[PDB]
Amino acid sequence: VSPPPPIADEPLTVNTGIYLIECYSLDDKAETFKVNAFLSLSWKDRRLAFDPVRSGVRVKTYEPEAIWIPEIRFVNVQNARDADVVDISVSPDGTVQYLERFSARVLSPLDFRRYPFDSQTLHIYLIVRSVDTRNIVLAVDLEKVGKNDDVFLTGWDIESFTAVVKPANFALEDRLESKLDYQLRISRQYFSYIPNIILPMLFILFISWTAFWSTSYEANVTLVVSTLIAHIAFNILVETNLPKTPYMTYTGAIIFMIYLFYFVAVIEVTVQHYLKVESQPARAASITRASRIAFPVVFLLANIILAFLFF
Amino acid sequence: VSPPPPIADEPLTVNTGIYLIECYSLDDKAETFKVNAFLSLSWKDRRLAFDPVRSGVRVKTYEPEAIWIPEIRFVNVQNARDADVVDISVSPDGTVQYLERFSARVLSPLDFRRYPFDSQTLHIYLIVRSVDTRNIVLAVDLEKVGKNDDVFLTGWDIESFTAVVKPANFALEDRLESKLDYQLRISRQYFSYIPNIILPMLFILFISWTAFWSTSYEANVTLVVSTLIAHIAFNILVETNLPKTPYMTYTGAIIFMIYLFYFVAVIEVTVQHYLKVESQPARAASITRASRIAFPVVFLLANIILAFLFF
Amino acid sequence: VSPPPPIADEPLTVNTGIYLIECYSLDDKAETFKVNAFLSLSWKDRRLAFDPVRSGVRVKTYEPEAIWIPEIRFVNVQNARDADVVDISVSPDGTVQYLERFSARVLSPLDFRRYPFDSQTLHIYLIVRSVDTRNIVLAVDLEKVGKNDDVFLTGWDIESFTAVVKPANFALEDRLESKLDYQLRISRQYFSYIPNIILPMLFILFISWTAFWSTSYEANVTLVVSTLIAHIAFNILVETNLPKTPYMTYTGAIIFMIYLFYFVAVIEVTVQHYLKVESQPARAASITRASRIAFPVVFLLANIILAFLFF
Amino acid sequence: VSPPPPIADEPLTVNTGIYLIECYSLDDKAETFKVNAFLSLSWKDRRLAFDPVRSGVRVKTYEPEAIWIPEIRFVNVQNARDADVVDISVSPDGTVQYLERFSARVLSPLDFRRYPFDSQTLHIYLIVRSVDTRNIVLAVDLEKVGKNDDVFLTGWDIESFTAVVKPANFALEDRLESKLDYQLRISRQYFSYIPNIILPMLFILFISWTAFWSTSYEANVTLVVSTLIAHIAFNILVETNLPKTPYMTYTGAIIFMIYLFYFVAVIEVTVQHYLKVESQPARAASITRASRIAFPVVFLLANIILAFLFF
Amino acid sequence: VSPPPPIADEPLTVNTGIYLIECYSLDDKAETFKVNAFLSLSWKDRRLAFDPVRSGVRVKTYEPEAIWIPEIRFVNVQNARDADVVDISVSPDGTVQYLERFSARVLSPLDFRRYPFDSQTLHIYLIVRSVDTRNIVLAVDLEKVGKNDDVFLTGWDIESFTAVVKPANFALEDRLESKLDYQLRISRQYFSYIPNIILPMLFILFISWTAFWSTSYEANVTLVVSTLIAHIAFNILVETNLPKTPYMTYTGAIIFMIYLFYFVAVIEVTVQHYLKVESQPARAASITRASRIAFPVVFLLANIILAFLFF
Ligand SMILES: [Cl-]
Ligand SMILES: [Cl-]
Ligand SMILES: [Cl-]
Ligand SMILES: [Cl-]
Ligand code: NA
């Protein structure tokens, strides 16, 4: 089968629509999401036209083998979607209404700068390659774009699923390509990060600060070194959940900055001890009293500055 | 092949049944289960009718290619089931009795609020899409709904496998869809959580409390900081087995609360030492004696409050 | 093609045989094993009969598409086996001798009660579903049941591969099913568990007991708390290799019991210190001397009781 | 179908081109990358010749089954690419213009010597095997070689995608093979390695050096042994992200060298203590003062020497 | 199609050859390797004979569907290879020259006794099953056995790829089977094990021995218990890279033996302290001085004995 012939010099408009049935998974490290949805396609093939009077049937159902169908592909996939055709219905003027249910693993990059208080725009880019007989342009049938009520992405809140209705038409290997942008806007459920990472990480930091009410070097060294090791365990945990970014993430900046606080607390504990040993406990007492205020104050101000820079 | 024609204006009733052969797996993190079962379908196709006298045969066996079969799909799947047809038997009036054995990975969300003392209702939603020639409705043949006695889901107890017999009929892309709800009710085998997570986590908490019968700051700091680090190891272990929920789970609440107990025990140990150093051991002795009772009492009362809130 | 017709009212006997080519893998957590074997089937189809004189050929080779073949399936699989037919040979009386080489991932449950000194009976349940024209019964051709000499399951010793020659005949969805039980008896190579888990776990326990020859509370607290943390690391390691069971395993019971020994050792260390501080070192000396004998004696007796209960 | 016949004794030139649509993944441990691209092929088959007068059509579209297509394979793959033909267009003279969209997992080795400041040349080697009727040579159509602007490899910067235009023609099993070298030059985004591994690893090393301002053996032993254990945690983390190389990597050399610094710091701490105990604190004081300068100086010089050797 | 008929009572000789294109991966835990290679087959089918004079063509190319091809399978696989036929060329006498490119995951057991200084013989066992019409024997065409120069197995050195030219002919289910043994001899690149596991493990052992130049029980307990915990971390790391063997490996023996050294060092530290406390420092001083020499001497002699036993 060949594509539909033009009346004038007009391109063939393939109207499209995506209705999500299942999203469910998103892999932050791989920057992929798994989607299962309907892909509806519609175009006019005058060669398939008929009259209700003489034909009897008001609509004709066809097998994909029997008629011409445009080759629609997703841009941002590593493996092409697994499609199963559901229905092909031809109307009197030859308007074909195609429907398939697909499953794909879509490669859409994430911006982790504000992680875990980040929002993302996930994309599904539909594309059609023009043939020598006719140029094929894609369109959006907004009534056939949407999502099922039960669509819930684990660890995320789905805000919208829309389409940039004007295609990106361009040349690629001396043939026109018509690209459409379907956008799934999501925002992270940051909740669990608070009792599991943020508050435990702060509690161990505040425990290292009890060294400012202790004259015992041996105990101080245990407090600051023990909690530093628990901090490294949270840093390793956090960095396993995320990919390696050429920029700093919000959590990454706090995790990094908290090392400097442990480092400076080791210096304070060292200084305090050296002075007691040098028979200067009055000088040591002054530094320790200042540290009791300076460490929480600088921690609160430094975190205000970070939240300002990131949000 | 086209669908069966109606006598009046009646829809085609496709009677369904699911008989589980294997369940075996459930992934809490992914919120999926793997199922292997029989899917029996039955409908009337008058075009396939015959008489026992003239035909000889009392039933006719058909290949799926030879006759019309309704396109039945599962709603809550990422990838469509792998089906193998077992038998297609046509009776005199044209009653088709279809049987397939399928395997699918079903996306069914879990409520972890009471974890690991949680029960779940897993679902398999069957769906049929109506054609232009006829509207297709799904039904439940309760005699063909069940499970094999050897069906055992690892780490769970299967309570029941039933079907919500009245379908959810609705419009989707200007065509009727007939959805059925098959429900597998399960309850978690909470047993192993007790000797592996709950009791080890309590033993290390009770070891931190021996600091209330010690005047040795260095030893106290080791007791409370060491056991806090073993608590973090159990918190990380627990959170790897579960997905990130926008609500608190039962185990998550206990795990979180136990951090506050370690934190307050570090404050007690600090206060006690500061006082001995300030030559106030009588005041420190009073706080330490109160702590011996206050810590277990508040721990028991706080756990009673939690169990009340969650169950 | 239809099934072979009966002479009288006799069912069709499909003789079966499984010859293992590769086993190699068993996953304790998933409770699955991967098998690659020959599946030989044999039945009489009189419609395929011929005479050696007039036909010339003493045996006729057929493609599976050309003749009737019984639909044989495995019960305990999530996904059906991948089969490749090797040969189909028809003898003069119409005796069909079918041979395929398959690969399957079989769901067979394990009893971890005596882990890692456990033995298991793995099963492959063959099943045939009777047709309306004839009832199909399965049989065992013991000469066609066996295993290749090179068949070795990693981490296990294969003891036998036999078949329960009498099928379990029963009704399922108003049709007879004929089930056969192929049993692969295996016993775990418990060796590596000794230098990798058992002896390291005992060495750290015996190191905690050196606290009974020490008056130093600070050192004692380090000995018992440090080794408890290494015990938790072994408990986590062990529980990652096994699934969550609604019963206690042998290793699990020892691992759990050893926590009680650490807990009681923390109590002894606490009591001993409290007494030295209260100026009662003579009383503390008595408890410490008793502990030196009591801890190893109760440990040896408690382990004798466990080994009795489990074996 | 047989291959096109020659006019003279000329080989068939199959012009090739690869246009990358998605790269996205690279696995350092496996030394693989996942690619999704267009593979365009072009050759002359005079047997397929026609012209618009007599045929009507100016170009003829063909199914791959209908015409001869050269068997083009990738050399460096474990599993052959998943190809989907997009278009086959036959011109006047019989010039076939083939286009497929493939997905492959390509095995291309990496040189980790300068890790994580390393650059790599990834390869896709195309190959064609000559037939007895005709020798087949591969060529590069540079206008059909390139990459999409949105092509971004996670954790890397893509520098170029070119082709070594002259094929490597050679004999293999008494038949000519024509190999082409497509090269994807990439450089690692080393950024994240700094706040996540390099700076944390240096902070813990500098904390071990506070032992040079402490006379407390107990505290010193805790400082150096605790931080050594956090160093081992970073060494294990680093070695899990990389494969086992028969050469030293840059990060591996620093990680290894830092062990010698911990070892020598344990010797210093031991020596210092032994002397204080032997009533030689003046000698110990001299060694400790020298160490305060020697450790950072030798660390800075040793790192200059390493950076010199590796870059 | 039927197999070629014999002249006398001679079996059909199927000449074979394997030319490796990619090896690349080997999984020690699974005891598998992934291979991609050419499989060339050659046999005489007199029914396919022709004369160059009358036929014109000097060689005839055939599709696999058109002629008889022997069913060749690999013995040691879980899943059968993915093959793609490259060429089938028939010579005048009817000599068929078949060529396919396959990909397989081969199950070949490894001997870890000398790990990581081990060498292995990996096998690919080809097999053919004789038919009733003719007995089929396999042979080796040594000119068609080899490997590509770019074939490099990550973490290993390939020493040779040869074939045991005489097949293992045997009966299996009353039919002859002809098995060939292709052997890939490899030796491990042990290099990385030295800076990553061996030297770090020795450095922490030598750090525990600094306790023989310390009178400080508290410090000694920290030195030996801390380093024991880092030893357990290396033991767990090593045992995750290897499968559970019913024999001791070289690394496993050293790792195990080093626990006894830690255990005895804890006894020494305990004895030394007990004596100082009992006012016997002269006796304790003697044991500590002996230990300084005894521990390294016994460690060096015990390692010489092990290297002797294993190599
Ligand atoms: Cl390929
Ligand atoms: Cl095979
Ligand atoms: Cl024999
Ligand atoms: Cl034979
Ligand atoms: Na300490």
Residue numbers in the entry:
A (entry chain C), B (entry chain D), C (entry chain E), D (entry chain B), E (entry chain A): 5 to 315
From the paper:
In the lower part of the ECD, the principal (+) face also carries two acidic residues, E82 and D115. E82Q and D115N display significantly higher proton sensitivity than E82A and D115A, respectively. Assuming that Gln and Asn faithfully mimic protonated side chains of Glu and Asp, this would suggest that residues E82 and D115 are also proton sensors. To investigate this idea, the structures of E82Q and E82A were solved at pH 4. The E82A structure is similar to that of the Wt pH 4 structure, whereas that of E82Q shows a marked local reorganization of the Q82 moiety. The E82Q side chain takes on a different rotamer, causing a local change in the backbone, as well as a cascading rotamer/conformational change in Y28 and F156, the latter of which flips out towards the aqueous environment. All structures were in the apparently open conformation.
At present, the best structurally characterized pLGIC is the G. violaceus ligand-gated ion channel (GLIC), of prokaryotic origin. Each subunit consists of an extracellular domain (ECD), predominantly in a β-sandwich fold, and a transmembrane domain (TMD) composed of four helices, labeled M1–M4. However, the GLIC is a pH-gated channel, activated by lowering the pH, with a maximal activation at pH 4 and a pH50 around 5. We instead found that proton activation is a complex multiple loci mechanism, with the key contribution stemming from the coupling interface between the extracellular and transmembrane domain, with E35 acting as a key proton-sensing residue.
